[PDB]
Protein backbone atom coordinates (compact mmCIF):
# COMPACT_ATOMS: atom_id res chain seq x y z
CA UNK A 1 0.00 0.00 0.00
CA UNK A 2 1.18 3.44 -0.91
CA UNK A 3 4.70 4.76 -1.57
CA UNK A 4 7.96 3.18 -2.78
CA UNK A 5 10.91 3.51 -0.36
CA UNK A 6 14.29 2.68 -1.94
CA UNK A 7 16.91 0.51 -0.22
CA UNK A 8 20.26 -0.86 -1.50
CA UNK A 9 21.92 -3.86 0.12
CA UNK A 10 25.44 -3.05 -1.09
CA UNK A 11 28.35 -4.26 1.10
CA UNK A 12 27.23 -5.77 4.45
CA UNK A 13 24.13 -4.66 6.36
CA UNK A 14 21.42 -3.14 4.05
CA UNK A 15 20.50 0.54 4.22
CA UNK A 16 16.96 1.81 3.86
CA UNK A 17 16.77 5.39 2.62
CA UNK A 18 14.02 7.32 4.45
CA UNK A 19 15.16 10.56 2.75
CA UNK A 20 13.93 13.98 3.81
CA UNK A 21 12.63 14.05 7.39
CA UNK A 22 11.83 16.61 10.07
CA UNK A 23 12.91 15.53 13.55
CA UNK A 24 12.49 16.25 17.26
CA UNK A 25 9.47 16.33 19.54
CA UNK A 26 8.43 19.98 19.33
CA UNK A 27 9.12 20.68 15.65
CA UNK A 28 7.55 17.45 14.38
CA UNK A 29 4.49 18.68 16.34
CA UNK A 30 4.56 21.98 14.40
CA UNK A 31 4.85 20.15 11.09
CA UNK A 32 2.23 19.85 8.38
CA UNK A 33 0.01 17.31 10.25
CA UNK A 34 -0.34 15.50 6.88
CA UNK A 35 3.45 15.11 6.67
CA UNK A 36 4.34 14.29 10.26
CA UNK A 37 2.11 11.34 9.25
CA UNK A 38 3.68 10.84 5.81
CA UNK A 39 7.21 10.67 7.16
CA UNK A 40 6.56 8.68 10.35
CA UNK A 41 5.14 5.92 8.10
CA UNK A 42 8.18 5.45 5.85
CA UNK A 43 10.21 5.03 9.04
CA UNK A 44 7.88 2.43 10.56
CA UNK A 45 7.72 0.52 7.26
CA UNK A 46 11.54 0.47 6.99
CA UNK A 47 12.02 -0.30 10.69
CA UNK A 48 9.60 -3.24 10.22
CA UNK A 49 11.30 -4.04 6.91
CA UNK A 50 14.71 -4.75 8.52
CA UNK A 51 13.09 -6.20 11.67
CA UNK A 52 12.19 -9.03 9.26
CA UNK A 53 15.45 -9.15 7.23
CA UNK A 54 18.18 -9.70 9.83
CA UNK A 55 18.96 -6.10 10.62
CA UNK A 56 19.97 -2.92 8.88
CA UNK A 57 20.46 0.81 9.14
CA UNK A 58 18.00 3.54 8.11
CA UNK A 59 19.68 6.62 6.60
CA UNK A 60 17.63 9.84 7.00
CA UNK A 61 18.44 13.33 5.72
CA UNK A 62 17.43 15.97 8.28
CA UNK A 63 15.09 18.79 7.19
CA UNK A 64 14.88 21.22 10.12
CA UNK A 65 18.25 23.01 10.23
CA UNK A 66 20.06 23.03 13.55
CA UNK A 67 18.44 19.95 15.01
CA UNK A 68 20.13 18.99 18.29
CA UNK A 69 19.53 15.44 19.43
CA UNK A 70 19.73 15.40 23.23
CA UNK A 71 17.81 18.71 23.13
CA UNK A 72 14.95 18.36 20.61
CA UNK A 73 13.79 14.77 21.28
CA UNK A 74 13.20 12.13 18.59
CA UNK A 75 9.47 12.82 18.11
CA UNK A 76 8.74 9.53 16.31
CA UNK A 77 5.76 7.30 17.11
CA UNK A 78 7.16 3.78 17.30
CA UNK A 79 5.35 0.66 18.50
CA UNK A 80 6.40 -0.28 21.98
CA UNK A 81 7.77 -3.78 21.41
CA UNK A 82 9.70 -2.41 18.42
CA UNK A 83 11.81 -0.12 20.59
CA UNK A 84 13.74 -2.96 22.28
CA UNK A 85 15.53 -3.05 18.83
CA UNK A 86 16.22 0.63 18.21
CA UNK A 87 19.50 2.52 18.57
CA UNK A 88 19.00 6.03 17.19
CA UNK A 89 21.82 8.53 16.62
CA UNK A 90 22.88 11.66 14.68
CA UNK A 91 25.61 12.87 12.28
CA UNK A 92 25.55 16.47 10.95
CA UNK A 93 22.57 16.96 8.68
CA UNK A 94 21.84 13.21 8.61
CA UNK A 95 20.28 10.73 11.11
CA UNK A 96 20.71 6.95 11.58
CA UNK A 97 18.54 4.15 13.01
CA UNK A 98 20.11 0.76 13.63
CA UNK A 99 17.54 -2.08 13.54
CA UNK A 100 18.51 -5.34 15.22
CA UNK A 101 16.95 -8.49 13.73
CA UNK A 102 13.52 -9.20 15.24
CA UNK A 103 14.72 -12.72 16.20
CA UNK A 104 11.17 -13.84 17.09
CA UNK A 105 10.80 -11.41 20.03
CA UNK A 106 7.58 -12.25 21.99
CA UNK A 107 7.40 -15.69 20.34
CA UNK A 108 5.72 -13.96 17.39
CA UNK A 109 7.82 -14.99 14.35
CA UNK A 110 7.77 -11.54 12.69
CA UNK A 111 7.33 -7.82 13.01
CA UNK A 112 3.95 -6.53 11.94
CA UNK A 113 2.90 -2.91 11.80
CA UNK A 114 -0.80 -3.82 11.79
CA UNK A 115 -2.52 -7.19 11.44
CA UNK A 116 -5.82 -5.83 10.02
CA UNK A 117 -7.35 -8.74 11.95
CA UNK A 118 -10.26 -7.19 13.84
CA UNK A 119 -12.47 -8.60 16.54
CA UNK A 120 -15.28 -7.00 18.54
CA UNK A 121 -15.17 -7.83 22.25
CA UNK A 122 -18.02 -6.44 24.42
CA UNK A 123 -19.00 -2.99 23.05
CA UNK A 124 -15.85 -2.21 21.10
CA UNK A 125 -14.10 -3.20 17.84
CA UNK A 126 -10.27 -3.40 18.08
CA UNK A 127 -7.59 -4.79 15.87
CA UNK A 128 -5.54 -7.65 17.29
CA UNK A 129 -1.87 -6.88 17.85
CA UNK A 130 0.43 -9.57 16.57
CA UNK A 131 0.35 -11.08 20.04
CA UNK A 132 -3.47 -11.41 19.91
CA UNK A 133 -3.66 -12.55 16.27
CA UNK A 134 -1.03 -15.26 16.72
CA UNK A 135 -3.25 -17.00 19.28
CA UNK A 136 -6.52 -16.57 17.32
CA UNK A 137 -4.74 -18.00 14.28
CA UNK A 138 -3.49 -20.92 16.40
CA UNK A 139 -7.06 -21.28 17.79
CA UNK A 140 -8.88 -21.28 14.44
CA UNK A 141 -6.39 -23.69 12.89
CA UNK A 142 -8.62 -26.48 14.31
CA UNK A 143 -11.88 -27.73 12.65
CA UNK A 144 -15.23 -28.72 14.28
CA UNK A 145 -29.28 -12.44 20.10
CA UNK A 146 -32.98 -12.43 19.14
CA UNK A 147 -34.02 -8.81 19.67
CA UNK A 148 -31.13 -7.86 17.42
CA UNK A 149 -32.57 -9.98 14.63
CA UNK A 150 -36.09 -8.63 15.05
CA UNK A 151 -34.72 -5.14 14.43
CA UNK A 152 -32.72 -6.43 11.50
CA UNK A 153 -35.87 -7.10 9.49
CA UNK A 154 -38.01 -4.24 10.58
CA UNK A 155 -39.29 -2.23 7.64
CA UNK A 156 -39.95 1.25 9.09
CA UNK A 157 -38.23 3.33 11.78
CA UNK A 158 -38.94 6.69 13.45
CA UNK A 159 -36.46 9.58 13.38
CA UNK A 160 -34.82 9.97 16.78
CA UNK A 161 -36.57 6.76 17.96
CA UNK A 162 -34.37 5.41 20.78
CA UNK A 163 -34.22 1.65 20.18
CA UNK A 164 -34.41 -0.93 22.95
CA UNK A 165 -31.22 -2.65 21.90
CA UNK A 166 -27.76 -1.73 23.24
CA UNK A 167 -24.48 -2.13 21.38
CA UNK A 168 -22.91 -5.50 22.28
CA UNK A 169 -20.72 -8.27 20.88
CA UNK A 170 -23.38 -8.86 18.26
CA UNK A 171 -24.69 -5.29 17.78
CA UNK A 172 -22.69 -2.24 16.55
CA UNK A 173 -24.15 1.18 15.80
CA UNK A 174 -22.14 3.47 13.50
CA UNK A 175 -23.08 6.83 11.98
CA UNK A 176 -23.02 8.08 8.39
CA UNK A 177 -20.30 10.53 7.36
CA UNK A 178 -21.29 13.25 4.90
CA UNK A 179 -20.48 10.91 2.02
CA UNK A 180 -22.46 7.71 2.43
CA UNK A 181 -20.49 5.50 0.06
CA UNK A 182 -17.05 6.80 1.06
CA UNK A 183 -18.07 6.25 4.71
CA UNK A 184 -19.48 2.75 4.33
CA UNK A 185 -16.83 1.89 1.76
CA UNK A 186 -14.26 2.56 4.52
CA UNK A 187 -15.91 1.83 7.90
CA UNK A 188 -17.39 -1.49 6.71
CA UNK A 189 -14.43 -3.86 6.32
CA UNK A 190 -13.32 -3.33 9.89
CA UNK A 191 -16.81 -4.33 11.01
CA UNK A 192 -17.14 -7.34 8.71
CA UNK A 193 -13.69 -8.54 9.77
CA UNK A 194 -14.56 -8.03 13.42
CA UNK A 195 -17.86 -9.92 13.36
CA UNK A 196 -16.59 -12.80 11.18
CA UNK A 197 -13.66 -13.33 13.55
CA UNK A 198 -15.70 -13.02 16.76
CA UNK A 199 -19.06 -14.79 16.78
CA UNK A 200 -20.83 -12.73 14.07
CA UNK A 201 -23.22 -9.83 14.44
CA UNK A 202 -25.06 -6.77 13.09
CA UNK A 203 -23.79 -3.37 11.91
CA UNK A 204 -26.45 -0.70 11.91
CA UNK A 205 -25.33 2.20 9.74
CA UNK A 206 -26.96 5.48 10.59
CA UNK A 207 -27.71 4.94 14.27
CA UNK A 208 -26.14 7.04 17.01
CA UNK A 209 -24.28 4.85 19.48
CA UNK A 210 -24.18 6.65 22.86
CA UNK A 211 -28.02 7.00 22.73
CA UNK A 212 -29.15 4.07 20.55
CA UNK A 213 -31.24 6.62 18.62
CA UNK A 214 -32.22 6.07 14.99
CA UNK A 215 -30.89 8.93 12.71
CA UNK A 216 -30.50 7.92 9.06
CA UNK A 217 -29.42 10.10 6.12
CA UNK A 218 -31.23 12.22 3.51
CA UNK A 219 -33.19 9.85 1.30
CA UNK A 220 -31.51 11.47 -1.69
CA UNK A 221 -27.79 11.51 -0.80
CA UNK A 222 -27.82 7.65 -1.10
CA UNK A 223 -28.79 5.26 -3.86
CA UNK A 224 -29.85 1.82 -2.73
CA UNK A 225 -29.30 0.13 -6.10
CA UNK A 226 -25.56 0.97 -6.25
CA UNK A 227 -24.81 0.94 -2.55
CA UNK A 228 -25.64 -2.75 -2.53
CA UNK A 229 -23.28 -3.25 -5.45
CA UNK A 230 -20.42 -1.32 -3.85
CA UNK A 231 -21.17 -3.08 -0.52
CA UNK A 232 -21.01 -6.47 -2.15
CA UNK A 233 -17.88 -5.50 -4.04
CA UNK A 234 -16.27 -4.48 -0.81
CA UNK A 235 -16.99 -7.70 1.09
CA UNK A 236 -15.93 -10.02 -1.70
CA UNK A 237 -12.66 -8.03 -1.84
CA UNK A 238 -11.83 -8.82 1.80
CA UNK A 239 -8.69 -10.95 2.19
CA UNK A 240 -9.46 -14.15 4.06
CA UNK A 241 -7.19 -17.03 4.92
CA UNK A 242 -8.58 -20.55 5.27
CA UNK A 243 -7.42 -23.47 7.40
CA UNK A 244 -10.34 -25.79 6.62
CA UNK A 245 -11.18 -27.79 3.52
CA UNK A 246 -14.73 -26.45 2.94
CA UNK A 247 -13.55 -22.87 2.10
CA UNK A 248 -16.76 -20.70 1.88
CA UNK A 249 -17.41 -17.05 1.19
CA UNK A 250 -18.30 -14.62 3.94
CA UNK A 251 -22.01 -15.15 4.38
CA UNK A 252 -23.75 -11.79 4.93
CA UNK A 253 -27.11 -10.03 4.56
CA UNK A 254 -27.93 -6.39 3.72
CA UNK A 255 -31.20 -4.64 4.48
CA UNK A 256 -32.22 -1.00 4.05
CA UNK A 257 -34.39 0.11 6.96
CA UNK A 258 -36.48 3.15 5.94
CA UNK A 259 -36.64 5.96 8.50
CA UNK A 260 -39.81 8.10 8.68
CA UNK A 261 -40.96 11.21 10.60
CA UNK A 262 -44.41 12.82 10.26
CA UNK A 263 -45.50 9.96 7.95
CA UNK A 264 -42.80 11.37 5.67
CA UNK A 265 -40.63 8.77 3.91
CA UNK A 266 -37.41 10.48 4.71
CA UNK A 267 -34.12 8.74 5.23
CA UNK A 268 -32.36 5.42 5.60
CA UNK A 269 -30.57 3.06 7.97
CA UNK A 270 -28.10 0.57 6.49
CA UNK A 271 -28.03 -2.86 8.14
CA UNK A 272 -25.50 -5.61 7.53
CA UNK A 273 -25.60 -9.05 9.20
CA UNK A 274 -22.28 -10.93 9.20
CA UNK A 275 -22.42 -14.61 10.16
CA UNK A 276 -19.67 -16.15 12.25
CA UNK A 277 -16.87 -17.36 9.99
CA UNK A 278 -15.09 -20.66 9.50
CA UNK A 279 -11.35 -19.23 9.52
CA UNK A 280 -10.10 -15.76 9.44
CA UNK A 281 -11.15 -12.55 7.65
CA UNK A 282 -8.68 -9.53 7.35
CA UNK A 283 -10.00 -6.07 6.74
CA UNK A 284 -7.18 -5.38 4.31
CA UNK A 285 -3.74 -6.92 3.80
CA UNK A 286 -1.52 -7.27 6.92
CA UNK A 287 0.74 -4.23 7.06
CA UNK A 288 4.03 -6.10 7.37
CA UNK A 289 7.19 -5.69 5.39
CA UNK A 290 10.37 -7.29 4.17
CA UNK A 291 13.38 -6.13 2.19
CA UNK A 292 12.87 -8.03 -1.08
CA UNK A 293 15.08 -6.95 -3.98
CA UNK A 294 16.20 -3.36 -3.42
CA UNK A 295 12.75 -2.09 -2.46
CA UNK A 296 10.80 -2.42 0.75
CA UNK A 297 7.91 -4.63 -0.36
CA UNK A 298 4.75 -5.59 1.57
CA UNK A 299 4.09 -9.14 2.70
CA UNK A 300 1.13 -10.80 0.96
CA UNK A 301 -1.56 -12.29 3.11
CA UNK A 302 -0.79 -15.92 2.30
CA UNK A 303 2.87 -15.39 3.29
CA UNK A 304 2.18 -13.27 6.35
CA UNK A 305 -0.09 -15.99 7.77
CA UNK A 306 2.35 -18.81 6.92
CA UNK A 307 5.21 -16.70 8.40
CA UNK A 308 3.24 -16.36 11.65
CA UNK A 309 2.67 -20.10 11.91
CA UNK A 310 6.27 -21.26 11.57
CA UNK A 311 5.65 -20.91 15.36
ZN1 LIG B 1 -12.47 -21.87 6.47
Residue numbers in the entry: 1 to 144, 169 to 335
Give me lines lifted from the publication on this model:
The Schlafen family belongs to the interferon-stimulated genes and its members are involved in cell cycle regulation, T cell quiescence, inhibition of viral replication, DNA-repair and tRNA processing. Here, we present the cryo-EM structure of full-length human Schlafen 5 (SLFN5) and the high-resolution crystal structure of the highly conserved N-terminal core domain. SLFN5 binds tRNA as well as single- and double-stranded DNA, suggesting a potential role in transcriptional regulation. The N-terminal Slfn core domain (residues 1–336) is followed by a linker domain (residues 337–552) and a C-terminal helicase/ ATPase domain (residues 553–891).
To gain high resolution structural insights into human SLFN5, we crystallized the SLFN5 core domain (SLFN51–336). The core domain (38.9 kDa) behaves as a monomer in solution, as determined by right angle light scattering (RALS). SLFN51–336 crystallized in the space groups P3221 and P21, diffracting to 3.2 and 1.8 Å, respectively. The SLFN51- 336 structure depicts a horseshoe-like shape with a mixed α/β topology consisting of 10 α-helices and 14 β-sheets. The domain consists of an N-terminal and C-terminal lobe with respective bridging domain. Each lobe consists of four α-helices and five β-sheets and each bridging domain of one helix and two sheets. The SLFN51–336 structure comprises a zinc finger motif with the calculated anomalous map confirming the presence of a zinc ion. The zinc ion is coordinated by a histidine and three cysteine residues (H266, C268, C302, C303) that are highly conserved throughout the entire Schlafen protein family. The structure of SLFN51–336 shows similarity to the published structure of the N-terminal domain of rat Slfn13 (rSlfn1314–353).
